[PDB]
Every structure is written in C-alpha cells, then in structure tokens.
C-alpha cells in the first residue's frame, strides 16, 4: 500500500533555460584568460568550503576555524560536539588500524 | 528520505504469487510466505 494509486503530475524540465544553457561557461577561465582567475573562484557557496574538499571531520574543523566565531551558540555547541565525536570515531574506531 | 524504495509492492508480489496456493497466513504475510516459498523451491 506504500504505492500511489495515481500517476504523479507530469514533470516538465526546460533543458534550455538560461541556467542549463549557460552551464559550464567560464570553467576554463584560467587557461583561456591568462590565468587571471582560477576556476575555483567561480564557486559560489559557503565561505569555508570554496575551492576545498575534505571528509566530514575536516569540513567541521574548517567551519569552526573560519566561521566559528560567527556561528550561533547552539549551532557552535553542536559543531564542537560533532568534531569531538568525529575525532573519536576516526582515530579510535574502524576495521583498519 | 532522500532515496526511498518504491517497488516494495512488486518485490513482495514476486514471492506472494508463488505463495498464493499455500494455507494459512503463509499465503498472505511476506515474513512467512518468503520462508515457505524458499522451502517449496
């Protein structure tokens, strides 16, 4: 009974809207623009993970380091607890050692 | 619930179809029908 009895409303996707049409443009800004701008500078998102990647523990550490002072009280407490738990898990648990 | 199973009905039916001719709840309840059908096969 976890199956709907009617077809869901048709999902129409405009493959040629502006976003999809111009997606990927300026990805080669560096190599095609005398390397004035690195492609990572085209990344819009959280300040602490612009042009950067890492596991959950590294991401949490970076977030606390970069915006920890601007975080809300309970959010920062949660981040500290998450960093503590991730440290314990990654440094004391796992199949391989 | 990013990813959820939507075929569970058909997954259950694939066994209930072979269990339809059993007796009792073995022909209706998957938890029982699957065991009975495995034994039958």
């Amino acid at each position: 009974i976890g199956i709907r009895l009617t077809l869901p409303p048709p999902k129409v996707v405009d493959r040629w809207n502006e976003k999809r049409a111009m997606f990927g443009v300026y990805d080669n800004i560096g190599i095609l623009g005398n390397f004035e701008k690195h492609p990572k500078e085209l990344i819009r998102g959280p300040i602490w993970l612009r042009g950067w990647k890492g596991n959950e523990l590294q991401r949490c550490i970076r977030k606390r380091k970069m915006v920890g002072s601007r975080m809300f009280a309970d959010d920062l407490h949660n981040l500290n607890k998450r960093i503590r738990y991730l440290y314990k898990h990654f440094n004391r648990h796992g199949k391989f050692r | 619930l990013r990813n959820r199973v939507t075929d569970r009905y058909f997954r259950i039916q694939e066994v209930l179809k072979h269990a339809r001719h059993f007796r009792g709840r073995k022909n209706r309840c998957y938890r029982l029908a699957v065991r009975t059908v495995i034994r039958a096969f």
């Binding site: 709907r4 | 619930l1 075929d7």
Partner: peptide, 26 residues
Amino acid sequence: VKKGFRAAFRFQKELERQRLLRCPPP
C-alpha cells in the same frame, strides 16, 4: 508521498491488468 514515477507507472499497469481481468472486455 514517495518521489518517483516508474513505480507508479508499473502499479498503474498492474491496476489496468487487474481491472481487465475483473471485467474482461467483450
């Protein structure tokens, strides 16, 4: 509601089959 279309389509086909079996056409 579970997002998706293919399971719903399969169930619609099965419902059509059951409807035909219950009320076979002339």
